[PDB]
Design a binder for these strands. Structure first.
Ligand SMILES: [Cl-]
Ligand SMILES: [Cl-]
Ligand SMILES: [K+]
Ligand SMILES: [Mg+2]
Ligand SMILES: [Mg+2]
Ligand SMILES: [Mg+2]
Ligand SMILES: [Mg+2]
Ligand SMILES: [Mg+2]
Ligand SMILES: [Mg+2]
Ligand SMILES: [Mg+2]
Ligand SMILES: [Mg+2]
Ligand SMILES: [Mg+2]
Ligand SMILES: [Mg+2]
Ligand SMILES: [Mg+2]
Ligand SMILES: [Mg+2]
Ligand SMILES: [Mg+2]
Ligand SMILES: [Mg+2]
Ligand SMILES: [Mg+2]
Ligand SMILES: [Mg+2]
Ligand SMILES: [Mg+2]
Ligand SMILES: [Mg+2]
Ligand SMILES: [Mg+2]
Ligand SMILES: [Mg+2]
Ligand SMILES: [Mg+2]
Ligand SMILES: [Mg+2]
Ligand SMILES: [Mg+2]
Ligand SMILES: [Mg+2]
Ligand SMILES: [Mg+2]
Ligand SMILES: [Mg+2]
Ligand SMILES: [Mg+2]
Ligand SMILES: [Mg+2]
Ligand SMILES: [Mg+2]
Ligand SMILES: [Mg+2]
Ligand SMILES: [Mg+2]
Ligand code: NA
Ligand code: NA
Ligand code: NA
Ligand code: NA
Ligand code: NA
Ligand code: NA
Ligand code: NA
Ligand code: NA
Ligand code: NA
Ligand code: NA
Ligand code: NA
Ligand code: NA
Ligand code: NA
Ligand code: NA
Ligand code: NA
Ligand code: NA
Ligand code: NA
Ligand code: NA
Ligand code: NA
Ligand code: NA
Lengths: 53, 337, 132
RNA sequence: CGAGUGGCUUGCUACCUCGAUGUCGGUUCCCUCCAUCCUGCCCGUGCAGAAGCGGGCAAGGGUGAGGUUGUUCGCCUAUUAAAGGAGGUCGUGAGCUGGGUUUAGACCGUCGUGAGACAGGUCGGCUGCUAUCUACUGGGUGUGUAGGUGUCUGACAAGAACGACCGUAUAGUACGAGAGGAACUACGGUUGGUGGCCACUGGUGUACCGGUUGUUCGAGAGAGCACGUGCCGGGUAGCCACGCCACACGGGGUAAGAGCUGAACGCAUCUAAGCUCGAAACCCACUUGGAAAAGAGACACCGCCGAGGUCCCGCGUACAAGACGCGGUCGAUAGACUCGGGGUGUGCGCGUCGAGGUAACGAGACGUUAAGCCCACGAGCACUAACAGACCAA
RNA sequence: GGUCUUAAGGUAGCGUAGUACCUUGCCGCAUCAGUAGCGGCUUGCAUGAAUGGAUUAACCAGAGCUUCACUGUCCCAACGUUGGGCCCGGUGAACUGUACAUUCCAGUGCGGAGUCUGGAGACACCCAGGGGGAAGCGAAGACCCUAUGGA
RNA sequence: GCGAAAGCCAAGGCCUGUCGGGAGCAACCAACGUUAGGGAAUUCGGCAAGUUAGUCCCGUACCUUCGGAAGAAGGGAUGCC
RNA sequence: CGUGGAAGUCUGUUAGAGUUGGUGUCCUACAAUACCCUCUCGUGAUCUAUGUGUAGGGGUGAAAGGCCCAUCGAGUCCGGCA
């Protein structure tokens, strides 16, 4: 599986899945990614993210 | 009317003092059933990771499905049964009769013992056989020690010595079995005693925490609300009633917490292998790299990394053995991050 | 009850205000009790995903308001652990009003439901638009 | 109507204390009683079943959360297997609280000529002390047993280490016209308690990295202060719970009870002798402690001119002193360095762009740059430091 | 009752009151549940007109209650920061002390004993702790009564 | 900056609010920071703590002695160049 | 609409005055009434220095029996007094 945020492969037996209000789903690999998302930041704009570089 | 409530902490693990031996001492052994064999083994705690397993349980709706399981990695290199001690039944319980030692000794066993230079194995053996004829022979155990030198991550070279009982068929057969093992060089491994999937009882001296208060040591409440601001925060209400005019040992008080012996029951042995398959990237924090004989114990194990832990076939298992569980994945992800 | 097939950290207590994920006319629910639960001295009775709880209606239609009904916790913000180790958490805390036979009192369910709830309450599940 | 038991209420008495034994209620923490609310095992039933009612044994465990009231008590709500009662100076103020009673201020009602009163109401109204002894929780030093190392034994001691509930199969079955509706057993889970652990989730993380406000060091760069981080964002190790793991069955002997054989009393009789069964209770099992068990223990080896130990040195799987554990060149114990593994989020400088502006100037953007900075972890590595050497000892 | 004591016999109002014994009065509101709070009723144990009655905008470190928001007050505790605490050098008191004193369970005793009686337990010294007991220390009881006391 | 406000810094003064040394420095205590989910369930009582906040624009109820209530409430904005 | 700038007026740790809660710290104290946070007033019946007057059954008192030099339902000292 891949982190719907940064893009790195989520280590099996790890991570969190956040269920949105509309029913959409988001698999996070870590707290760091979840937290950056809560700040309203988009992964493409963060240079360390595997979505960007 | 003052609601009821269970007391704070158990009264069955006391006194809560510092353990006399850092090396655990089993106070009970498995029953004599199958073929003769050593009833225990030892290793050094390394750390933890998780493994994906195929549901083994025949009664689980999830039978056959992927399942994530916590695992504690324990380095379990070969040990050495350096002697056969014999016990005799007496009106005052069991007492050691004699011991049959060997010649082949590990290069550094002298860091702990005054290794035998002159011994008569046959005389000791004879004394044991005569005792058996008389029908005064109690159980049979082996003086065993570890080889810390084989475990790079552990600073010690000084071996840890412990006695492990030998249970089996007839006493005659298990006596012979014992002697055979010893005579060789006493070299034996985890494989010889345990099989992946079996339940074992792991003993160990817990992580020390020095002196701690009743809240941490016994689980008593902290002062609440307004009381918490008066000058008392983590102290119990009282040491007891007016009468009896004395403090009962049952009241939760400050003291040594941690560094106690514990025998955790029914620990499933997930896998017994050798190599570096279980090692974590960057290395096990505060331990090092595993690359040799190991054992993957389900869940947690008492004690800190590097501490000696003991294995023993479960004396009171709840479930039937489900041998060699299918390990589909073992995490090697760094424990730092 | 039947195993949930997931470990739950109860995220609710007696007195908590949660969303009524249905069209019964009740908008907000106040937890009063948890079915089959028995706590301990000073402990606030706790409820989480998959529990059948007794509730009172705080917000909604005049007729529904102040009524004491039963419900089933469908979603919770506090995480839950699935067999594969992954944690699952929702955007809000929600429950669906239920009757004696555990059939949803309403006709339609609003928002997603956890797959674990489906195992326990079939008719509640067979009314779910989304099951995550 | 008669006979009692208890010492929880109330009353009586005036034995004890007026050179003071700190109040009510609550709280917190420990032990206990049984006249048993639940749970186990049973008997009867106006016992079909299901659900009950009543009774016996039984104190192992449990008996919870809230709304009014200072309340105890009690009323009420939703849960529950059940949400039992009572003793411990009406347990518990050298523990807490201080809402009430019962100081000095004040109001109202009633009474009084009045001061002022009230077994009426009401607002406000203080909580001292550095533990000598004893007691217990944990930690040491000695002596006794009478050289050392290692391994054990088990007199005794503690435990609730486990209690309870829901669901499925049994089964829409037995039972019952129907309505309704079980059990043995085998399974899954939950709750309370217990012990341990940190791979996972979560918290912290005034290590660290970044952003940014004010001010000061002329600007830049780079920094100080803003309470012991200015604020904001992220967060490693560790420690943790909100996270994770583990916590029987079975024997033995009994109670109530169900029976067997059986006499006194040719019959009958569960009892008088004997015997088969039978409780969550008792014993064992299991966990923890335990050679100071004065019958002060056992075994193996080493040693008595030398075994071993202490000091010393480098360190922690240990730690308030002390203690404990490991390493000490025949070495990886600690540091440096370099890798690895991690945190943050793209450095200074320079180049290009940049709304504009004659120009000067210019917030900011892109590139160089997965950059820069940083690490409580691991590995490699004797480079540095574990050197020198002292002492006790049958 | 359809006058009588002793002059009159409670009017406007307010009322279960900071005044209501009965009392958690009854009805309603509000809450899952409200001896509270507010409104109405009100025969007021024992309301009421400058002993002022009722009422009232503004004001209030004044008494009670409700809601939104907030949150470690709580569920249920954790980690961290600073100063102590602990060890070392120096300085260096006080409280308290009839004697003895390693106590525990029971009993007895002026009826609330470390010291009496019977048992049980108990090798000595020392460190840290939280305060169960010494009816702990502190103050010739401020309650109560008594004195041919005081103010 | 509204400011004799805060915070920072000159001049000037001081390191004498006058005992130090050591232990990642334990329990416990005093001040205090941060705590997931829940959100007054705590308690006599929200005690304690927390929330809000400066300025501008919009907008502002019952009641009222017409003064007030009122900063009611509620909504938006806020830097740099 | 502007001007004007009233008020025992508002906000305000300006100075200054006061002292509500914490029933915090202290309670052989730093202190025989202290410390910290919180809180009230802050153009007026305001606060304050110095000088000055009122004296003990007497003062003084926006009244609490408050205050009159740590002394108040009758100050303090010595005497009556053994
Ligand atoms: Cl408390
Ligand atoms: Cl409940
Ligand atoms: K008295
Ligand atoms: Mg991760
Ligand atoms: Mg206090
Ligand atoms: Mg980690
Ligand atoms: Mg309570
Ligand atoms: Mg006393
Ligand atoms: Mg009985
Ligand atoms: Mg008991
Ligand atoms: Mg009492
Ligand atoms: Mg009691
Ligand atoms: Mg006391
Ligand atoms: Mg006291
Ligand atoms: Mg004290
Ligand atoms: Mg009071
Ligand atoms: Mg009061
Ligand atoms: Mg009062
Ligand atoms: Mg002697
Ligand atoms: Mg700073
Ligand atoms: Mg009323
Ligand atoms: Mg008149
Ligand atoms: Mg005696
Ligand atoms: Mg007296
Ligand atoms: Mg009096
Ligand atoms: Mg007089
Ligand atoms: Mg929180
Ligand atoms: Mg409450
Ligand atoms: Mg309460
Ligand atoms: Mg407050
Ligand atoms: Mg004014
Ligand atoms: Mg002001
Ligand atoms: Mg003057
Ligand atoms: Mg007076
Ligand atoms: Na205090
Ligand atoms: Na305090
Ligand atoms: Na007492
Ligand atoms: Na006395
Ligand atoms: Na009390
Ligand atoms: Na019981
Ligand atoms: Na109550
Ligand atoms: Na008493
Ligand atoms: Na009390
Ligand atoms: Na007190
Ligand atoms: Na039995
Ligand atoms: Na001995
Ligand atoms: Na009158
Ligand atoms: Na005033
Ligand atoms: Na806090
Ligand atoms: Na004491
Ligand atoms: Na005008
Ligand atoms: Na003050
Ligand atoms: Na006078
Ligand atoms: Na005189």
């Amino acid at each position: 599986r891949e982190c719907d945020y940064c893009g790195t492969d989520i280590e099996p037996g790890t991570g969190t899945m956040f269920v949105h209000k509309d029913g959409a789903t988001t698999h996070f690999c870590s707290s760091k990614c979840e937290n950056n998302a809560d700040l309203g930041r988009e992964a493409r704009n963060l240079e360390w993210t595997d979505t960007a570089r | 009317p003052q609601p009821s409530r269970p007391r704070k902490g158990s009264l069955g693990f006391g006194p809560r003092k510092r353990s006399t031996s850092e090396t655990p001492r089993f106070n009970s052994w498995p029953s004599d059933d199958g073929q003769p064999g050593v009833q225990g083994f030892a290793g050094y705690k390394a750390g933890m990771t998780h493994v994906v397993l195929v549901n083994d349980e025949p009664n689980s709706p999830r039978e056959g499905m992927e399942e994530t399981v916590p695992v504690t990695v324990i380095e379990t290199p070969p040990m050495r049964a350096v002697a056969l001690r014999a016990y005799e039944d007496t009106p005052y319980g069991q007492r050691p009769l004699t011991e049959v030692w060997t010649d082949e000794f590990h290069s550094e066993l002298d860091r702990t013992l005054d290794v035998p230079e002159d011994h008569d194995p046959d005389a000791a053996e004879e004394q044991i056989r005569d005792a058996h004829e008389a029908g005064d022979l109690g159980d049979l155990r082996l003086i065993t020690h570890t080889v810390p030198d084989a475990v790079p991550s552990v600073p010690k070279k000084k071996p840890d010595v412990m006695e492990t009982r030998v249970g089996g068929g007839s006493v005659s057969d298990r006596l012979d079995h014992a002697l055979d093992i010893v005579e060789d060089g006493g070299e034996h491994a985890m494989n010889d005693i345990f099989r992946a999937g079996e339940y074992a009882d792991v003993a160990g001296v817990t992580k020390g925490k020095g002196t701690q208060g009743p809240v941490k040591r016994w689980g008593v409440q902290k002062r609440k609300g307004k009381h918490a601001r008066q000058g008392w925060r983590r102290r119990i209400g009282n040491l007891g009633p007016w009468n009896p005019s004395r403090v009962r040992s049952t009241v939760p008080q400050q003291g040594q917490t941690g560094y106690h012996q514990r025998t955790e029951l029914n620990k499933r042995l997930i896998d017994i292998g050798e190599g570096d398959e279980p090692t974590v990237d960057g290395g096990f924090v505060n331990y090092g790299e595993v690359d040799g004989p190991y054992t993957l114990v389900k869940g947690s194990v008492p004690g800190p990394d590097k501490r000696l832990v003991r294995f023993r076939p479960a004396v009171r298992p709840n479930d039937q053995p489900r041998l060699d569980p299918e390990v589909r994945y073992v995490s090697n992800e760094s424990n730092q991050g | 009850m039947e195993a949930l097939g997931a470990d739950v950290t109860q995220g609710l207590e007696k007195g908590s205000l949660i969303t009524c994920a249905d069209n019964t006319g009740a908008r907000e629910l106040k937890v009063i009790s948890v079915h089959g639960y028995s706590g301990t001295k000073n402990r606030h009775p706790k409820a989480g995903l998959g529990d059948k709880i007794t509730v009172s209606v705080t917000k909604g239609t005049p007729e529904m308001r102040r009524q004491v009904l039963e419900a089933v916790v469908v979603r919770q913000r506090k995480p839950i652990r699935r067999p594969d180790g992954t944690r699952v958490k929702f955007e809000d805390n929600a429950a669906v009003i239920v009757d004696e036979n555990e059939d949803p009192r309403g006709t339609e369910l609003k928002g997603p439901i956890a797959r674990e709830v489906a195992q326990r309450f079939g008719s509640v599940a067979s009314a779910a638009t989304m099951i995550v």
